[PDB]
Design a protein around this ligand. Structure first.
Ligand SMILES: [Zn+2]
Ligand SMILES: [Zn+2]
Ligand SMILES: [Zn+2]
Lengths: 100, 69, 1186, 144
RNA sequence: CGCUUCUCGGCUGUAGUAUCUGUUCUUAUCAGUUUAAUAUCUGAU
């Protein structure tokens, strides 16, 4: 996300598995986290979509509900043509809140 | 760091003149042979055929500016 | 301002060509890529022509194109790699006639980048995978399969990334149902960029690498990696499995090598050079095409060297090893980008410069006479393989497909005194260069022309039976007499045809299956084949003014306008209907629809009258002679014609205006175009196996359908009077048309194109030409790097003859030197010799632009190359013309080291027909831009702009400037101003003063451009085009005072920075811009002629309602109708600079090419109806251009 | 629809980007980003070139929020006014003596380069040859 | 259940920055580290 600056994306080669977003994350652009003008579907790589990891939220890791999307300002800047936008690590937020 | 390993041609705070210009020349050569019509224009300016111009460009992308310094 | 881009002539030069069963039938098709345009061509087997079936603008640059067949499949899908970061797999749907995009997979950012793939494209020959590859660092492998709906599916992209690696070519190695392998010519360059000695980059040989996709392990591994003893440029697949020795041929400079891994010893065979062709000081020879062929017994390759010498390459082999590779000189064809040899024995060559060709292979194999060559013949001393070239022996030319690429210079001018203007175009590279004249008309080929006495007012043409394939009678009606001619292929007047038209006639036809009718204003004569004259007299003393004839209906109108019907019975006689009507005025015209095949009478009848009204009347027997709907007209009707292909009524008036209505039991819309100052006469003509309508005015036009799209195009021919259809063995399908005192059997052979190309061939690549405005003649400078002038051709020929006598002629044959001397090879056919490097042939040719003959030819020296020409007339001397020619000397183009130029001054003495030398001034750099200015000339030396004036010894400078940057390439003046085009930066405005002689820079532009050519539009604005593809318009700010007399600049430049008011991407290097008016009755429009053959226009918008409507149309079409390659259309037009104030009309004119649900969606989003949107969408084109 | 309201709010952001408190500058830089991507391809490349003149001095800020807001604004103006204009701004700071300006100008050039690498080919400056190496792209320089 | 009188009331956690207030070196050279350049740091009189 852009709010949490320590989160890193997968950025490997994007396959054919369409990325999904959870119920808490619905409407968000993957890169921006803005809610308006979705234009392009999210294709996550094959390691980020394997077995138990299928149908899972791109940002969270929770159970996916809807399809994921890039906004139009990610489409026209071509931020959808870098890699798999699956946020890999869970770092320094929603972990100490679990510990609180 | 990770950009210049992954996306070639980027450059950093210590990029000399030769490295910047050799990335300039390699991107210029791939855009010459990529566009059809720049290759048309460079084939009219000689009498070389298009495959002669593409071989001449492709053999120059190895060391286009000269030996390093 | 707001512009609008239309393409009149689409691009014609071909970069890629592939072949295969794209329709899914037994016959094969070509699919070509014209850079921005993807077309499908069908090579018609019986008649040998090529017919375009579909032409789509993909709005990208198709960097590679390849067709592949799914395993156990009939259809071949097309695989497109482009400047978008997407592979896209297409399928030709022949039913809907479109390229349905099957698949589209994204892998990286867009544009012709160095890292992302798309440039190279290999496919497995079985059809199980596809590898799309970059020039550096990264490749991708898709795995294609077919799932249970017989539907194509792709896997995720595999990766085969290898850092610091150049890829010269990639190709699919055949392995029959084995793990698929791809071969590529890589090169690792990191040790070549680490060592400053410069020799480590001199021993860094290519590597043939084999990538093997493991379908079991789902990844790509480098299997084999073997170095190469010379740099190969591209590879050829060898078929394998059960067919042949599976491997990859490797072409290279002076060598062809079979290489295949595992056990084969590497087989080299040196390329056969010509016998003693005079172009090789030190120059090698590479292959440029592949053209594999698999004739179901053996397989061979039609390779082609860089001169054009097709070799037939064949492998002689044991069990699976190759024993030897052997080849022989197949033929010689102009140099091609791609060849597609077709099963059914055709060979299609796509010459990259000039016309493309389709040959029929006459003697394949060619295993009879010629000294064939082989790898295993133990020959030393270099090549020692010396074939002698010869004219065509194995191929015969069947079709020449026309093209204009490369358009190097163009003028819009009316030198031929025609009403419409003309396009005078330079074309070609090398000895195939040609000046082409283009008009808007259709090509009118005179099969036969006869003179007729008197003054004939009508003609008709009839057969004897309906089953007659050709005609048997021609009928000519003069003012007071008629004649009947007969065609026994030797046309003669006859007397016993049965007509006997002593009175003039109004019509004839073949009414019966074998029975005829004459209609004359004194009676109606049914003439059965057995010559039985059914005469019918006039009722009373009215005479028959008009008539409408059919197969099974006749309707005449007599004076006062009384309508009489006649039906053809199943008995075959004519029966008058028992109701007669006289209409509200006289009848000026009447017409009936042609009878359908199943139907037995024609339903509707249109009658035009003196009230300027046309009435439609049904003639079904329930309501015969009863009106349906009327239409008012502005002027007197003259002629009506009703056709289908969906019925249309075409109305030509007494002024030169044509209209069309749609037809049904009610009439519908209206379309119109001014054909014209003459009463328009309309005639049904059979054209291209369909119906077409010939309109007659001061110029004759033809309206004909072409894939549900009517083209109302004129005919490049004189004004005529009357016209009708024609068929014979002399002409299978033509027109019989009469003008003043004469008769013409003509044929319109080409019904596809827009322009009539007529070419006059030139010696070298013509740079630019000027127009001597008194007694119009073109003055062309032609200049080619790497080319001998023919004085040194003759000198080198005599020198090689002297050597062929002197080299041990004792034992003898000096016949060899003589026959070498006096047997020229046609350089337009066999390719010009290339004169090493830094040599420069050049001529100056004054040419009549009517007949196309060299009215004068002036050679130059060996390296003195012409670059800029101007005709002018000075003020210090009198009226006499002058020609200036900028010349250079020892120019060598890379690394750029000119040795100082000259400016030749000639006189253009006489009417302009010859060219006397006057003087020769030397200048210290190449004068690339000469321009007349206020009775003097302005010469751009290159960084130095000098005024010049005539002296009797040499040209004398009057001023100079030195602050203009890198290199001048264009000088254009509006009067008192100079627009100096830099070769890198931009337009630099310069003021010239009268009191002083200064040249003061007073404005420049902020962008860098690389301007090629430019054009003035207003006193302020300059439209320019650049090397990369764009078109900009630079308008000066409203103040920008010129009064600057003479240190800081503004940003290292001038002070009044000009501003840009459009930027637009075209996709080709636009090399000629001109403000003109292509159609009289139209308005001005910036015509651009690109380098890939295309011709377009940029037209302004009148009002904001038009501009806003077309903006919303194309803003909807970017959404509903995306381009084929996936390249975003806004981000294609905004390739280099972002787009500004230009609406792409090639996307707008794809509104007529969608399915009607999409058109209804967009049109209701526009709150109009789709015929009104298509009317509004073609109104701009017909108003501004063709 | 930002083609209609950009001339109304350009005198607002020109006042916000001159203000001392850097939250004004980070939020006005975000407005410049979204407005630049909203009027792409409509011919409003003059107002954005005006606002770039005020956005560009905030390059040397080191608060992370304002540096990512200004750098998002720069890579959102790259598509609006062109890679040529952003390369003219990024030039002559690429080889500045201080590392503190050299690395910021090199990372804005990296954003331009990976944003549009093909379009930069026409826009590169002409760099003359030194003794041992040749640097003039001669192929673009010659003319038919 | 109904009738009357009096009186009262209402109408947190997380990532990050910009500021004050607190306190600090008239060391002369030299050399090295370092910086855009000072500064800073390290030693011998
Ligand atoms: Zn986004
Ligand atoms: Zn991933
Ligand atoms: Zn979520």
């Amino acid at each position: 996300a852009k709010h949490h600056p320590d989160l890193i994306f997968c950025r490997k080669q994007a396959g054919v598995a369409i990325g999904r977003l959870c119920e808490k994350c619905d409407g968000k652009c993957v890169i921006c986290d803005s809610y308006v003008r979705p234009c392009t579907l999210v294709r996550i790589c094959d390691e980020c979509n394997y077995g138990s990891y299928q149908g899972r939220c791109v940002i969270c890791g929770g159970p996916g509900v809807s399809d994921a999307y890039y906004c139009k300002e990610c489409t026209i800047q071509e931020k959808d043509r870098d890699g798999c936008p699956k946020i890999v690590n869970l770092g320094s937020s929603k972990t100490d809140l679990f510990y609180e | 760091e990770h950009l210049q390993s992954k996306y070639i041609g980027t450059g950093h705070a210590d990029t000399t003149k030769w490295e910047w210009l050799v990335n300039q020349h390699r991107d210029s050569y791939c855009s010459y042979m990529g566009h059809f019509d720049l290759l048309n224009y460079f084939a009219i300016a000689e009498n070389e055929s298009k495959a002669r111009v593409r071989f001449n460009l492709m053999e120059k992308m190895l060391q286009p500016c000269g030996p390093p310094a | 301002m707001f512009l609008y881009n239309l393409t009149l002539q689409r691009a014609t030069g071909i970069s890629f060509a592939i072949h295969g069963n794209f329709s899914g039938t037994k016959q094969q098709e070509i699919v070509v890529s014209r850079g921005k345009i993807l077309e499908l061509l069908r090579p018609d087997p019986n008649t040998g022509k090529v017919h375009t079936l579909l032409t789509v603008e993909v709005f990208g640059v198709i960097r590679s194109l390849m067709a592949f067949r799914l395993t156990g499949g009939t259809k071949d899908y097309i695989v497109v790699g482009s400047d978008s970061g997407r592979i896209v797999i297409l399928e030709y749907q022949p039913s809907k006639n479109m390229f349905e995009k099957i698949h589209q997979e994204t892998f990286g950012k867009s544009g012709c980048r160095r890292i992302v793939p798309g440039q190279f494209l290999a496919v497995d020959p079985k059809g199980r995978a596809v590898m799309i590859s970059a020039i550096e660092k990264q490749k991708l492998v898709y795995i294609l399969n077919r799932d249970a709906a017989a539907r194509l599916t792709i896997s995720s992209p595999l990766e085969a990334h290898k850092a610091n690696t150049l890829v010269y070519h990639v190709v699919g190695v055949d392995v029959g149902f084995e793990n698929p392998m791809f071969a590529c010519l890589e090169m690792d360059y990191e040790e070549a960029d680490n060592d400053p000695t410069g020799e480590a980059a001199a021993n860094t040989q290519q590597t043939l690498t084999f990538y093997e996709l493991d379908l079991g392990l789902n990844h790509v591994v480098r299997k084999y990696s073997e170095p190469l003893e010379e740099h190969g440029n591209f590879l050829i697949t060898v078929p394998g499995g059960s067919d042949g020795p599976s491997g990859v041929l490797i072409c290279s400079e002076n060598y062809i090598t079979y290489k295949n891994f595992g056990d084969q010893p590497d087989i080299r065979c040196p390329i056969p050079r010509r016998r003693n062709d005079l172009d090789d000081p030190e120059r090698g020879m590479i292959f440029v095409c592949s053209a594999t062929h698999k004739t179901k017994s053996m397989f061979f390759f039609l390779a082609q060297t860089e001169q054009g010498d097709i070799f037939k390459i064949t492998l002689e082999t044991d069990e699976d090893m190759v024993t030897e590779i052997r080849l022989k000189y197949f033929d010689t064809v102009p140099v091609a980008a791609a060849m597609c040899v077709l099963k059914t024995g055709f060979l299609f060559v796509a010459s990259e410069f000039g016309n493309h060709y389709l040959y029929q292979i006459a003697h394949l194999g060619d295993d009879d006479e010629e000294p064939e060559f082989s790898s295993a013949m133990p020959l030393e001393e270099g090549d020692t393989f010396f074939f002698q070239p010869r004219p065509l022996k194995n191929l015969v030319l069947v079709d020449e497909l026309d093209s204009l690429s490369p358009i190097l210079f163009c003028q819009i001018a009316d030198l031929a005194n025609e009403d419409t203007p003309q396009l005078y175009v330079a074309c070609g590279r090398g000895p195939r260069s040609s000046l082409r004249v283009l008009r808007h008309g259709l090509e009118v080929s005179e099969m036969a022309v006869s003179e007729l006495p008197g003054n004939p007012n009508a003609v008709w043409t009839v057969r004897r039976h309906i089953e007659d394939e050709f005609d048997a009678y021609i009928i000519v009606s003069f003012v007071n007499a008629t004649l009947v001619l007969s065609i026994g292929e030797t046309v003669e007047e006859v007397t016993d045809s049965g007509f006997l038209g002593t009175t003039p006639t109004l019509s004839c036809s073949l009414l019966g299956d074998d029975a005829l009718v004459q209609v004359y204003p004194d009676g109606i004569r049914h003439i059965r084949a057995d010559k039985r004259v059914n005469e019918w007299k006039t009722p009373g003393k009215k005479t028959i003014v008009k008539c409408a004839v059919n197969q099974r209906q006749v309707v005449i109108a007599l004076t006062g306008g009384e309508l009489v019907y006649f039906e053809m019975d199943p008995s075959g006689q004519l029966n008058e209907y028992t109701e007669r009507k006289e209409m509200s005025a006289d009848v000026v015209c009447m017409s009936l629809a042609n009878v359908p095949p199943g139907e037995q009478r024609s339903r509707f009848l249109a009658v035009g009258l003196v009230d300027n009204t046309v009435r439609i009347i049904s003639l079904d027997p329930s309501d015969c002679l009863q009106p349906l709907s009327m239409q008012a007209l502005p002027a007197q009707p003259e002629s009506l014609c009703i056709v289908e292909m969906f019925l249309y009524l075409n109305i030509g008036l007494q002024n030169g205006v044509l209209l069309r209505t749609v037809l049904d039991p009610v009439t519908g819309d209206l379309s119109d175009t001014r054909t014209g100052s003459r009463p328009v006469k309309l005639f049904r003509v059979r054209m291209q196996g369909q119906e077409a309508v010939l309109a007659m005015s001061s110029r004759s036009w033809l309206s004909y359908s072409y894939q549900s799209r009517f083209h109302l195009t004129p005919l490049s021919y004189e004004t005529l009077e009357f016209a009708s259809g024609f068929a014979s063995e002399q002409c299978p399908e033509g027109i019989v048309a009469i003008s003043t005192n004469t008769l013409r059997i003509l044929a319109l052979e080409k019904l596809g194109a827009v322009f009539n190309q007529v070419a006059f061939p030139l010696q070298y690549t013509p740079r630019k030409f000027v127009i001597h405005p008194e007694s119009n003649n073109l003055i062309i400078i032609e200049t080619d790097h790497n080319a001998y002038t023919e004085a040194t051709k003759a000198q080198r020929k005599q020198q090689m003859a002297e050597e062929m006598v002197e080299a041990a002629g004792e034992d003898l044959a000096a016949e060899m030197a003589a026959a070498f001397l006096n047997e020229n090879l046609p350089e337009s056919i066999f390719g010009a010799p290339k004169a090493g490097n830094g040599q420069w042939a050049s001529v100056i040719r004054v040419m009549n632009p009517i007949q196309g003959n060299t009215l004068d030819l002036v050679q130059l020296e060996q390296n003195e190359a012409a670059f800029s020409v101007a005709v002018c007339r000075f003020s210090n001397t009198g009226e006499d013309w002058y020609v200036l020619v900028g010349v250079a000397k020892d120019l060598i183009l890379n690394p750029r080291s000119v040795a100082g130029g000259f400016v030749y001054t000639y006189k253009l003495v006489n009417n302009g027909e010859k060219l006397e030398f006057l003087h020769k001034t030397p200048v210290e750099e190449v004068p690339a831009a000469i321009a007349p200015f206020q009775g003097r000339v302005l010469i751009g030396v290159g960084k130095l702009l000098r005024v010049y004036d005539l002296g009797k010894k040499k040209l004398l400078r009057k001023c100079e400037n030195k602050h203009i940057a890198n290199y001048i390439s264009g000088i254009q003046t509006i009067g008192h101003r100079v627009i100096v085009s830099d070769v890198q930066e931009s337009f630099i405005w310069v003021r010239y003063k009268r009191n002083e002689n200064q040249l003061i820079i007073f404005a420049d532009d902020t962008y860098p451009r690389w301007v090629t050519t430019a054009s003035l539009l207003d006193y302020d604005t300059v439209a320019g085009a650049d090397k990369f593809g764009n078109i900009c318009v630079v308008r000066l700010p409203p103040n920008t005072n010129d009064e600057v007399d003479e240190d800081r600049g503004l940003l290292n430049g001038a002070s009044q920075k000009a501003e840009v008011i459009m930027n637009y991407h075209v996709g080709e290097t636009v090399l000629s811009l001109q403000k003109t008016t292509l159609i009289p009755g139209g308005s001005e429009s910036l015509v651009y002629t690109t380098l890939s053959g295309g011709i377009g226009i940029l037209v302004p918008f009148t009002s904001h309602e038009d501009h806003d409507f077309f903006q919303h149309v194309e803003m909807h079409l970017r959404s509903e109708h995306p381009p084929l390659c996936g390249r975003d259309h806004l981000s294609f037009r905004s390739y280099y600079f972002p787009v500004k104030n230009v609406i792409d009309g090639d996307l707008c004119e794809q509104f007529n090419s969608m399915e009607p649900n999409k058109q209804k969606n967009v049109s209701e989003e526009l709150d109009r109806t789709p015929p009104e949107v298509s009317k509004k969408l073609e109104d701009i084109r017909t108003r501004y251009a063709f | 629809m930002g083609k209609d309201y950009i001339y109304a709010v350009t005198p607002l952001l020109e006042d916000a980007l001159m203000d001392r408190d850097l939250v004004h500058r980070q939020t006005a830089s975000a407005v410049v980003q979204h407005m630049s991507l909203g009027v792409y391809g409509f011919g409003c490349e003059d107002s954005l070139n005006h606002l770039l003149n005020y956005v560009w001095p905030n390059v040397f800020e080191t608060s992370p929020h304002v540096i990512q807001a200004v750098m998002g604004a720069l890579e959102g103006l790259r598509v609006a006014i062109g890679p040529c204009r952003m390369l003219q701004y990024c030039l002559q700071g690429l080889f500045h003596p201080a590392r503190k300006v050299r690395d910021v100008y090199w990372k804005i050039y990296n954003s331009i380069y990976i944003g549009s690498q093909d379009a930069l080919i026409a826009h590169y400056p002409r760099i003359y040859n030194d003794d041992k190496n040749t640097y003039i792209r001669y192929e673009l320089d010659y003319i038919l």
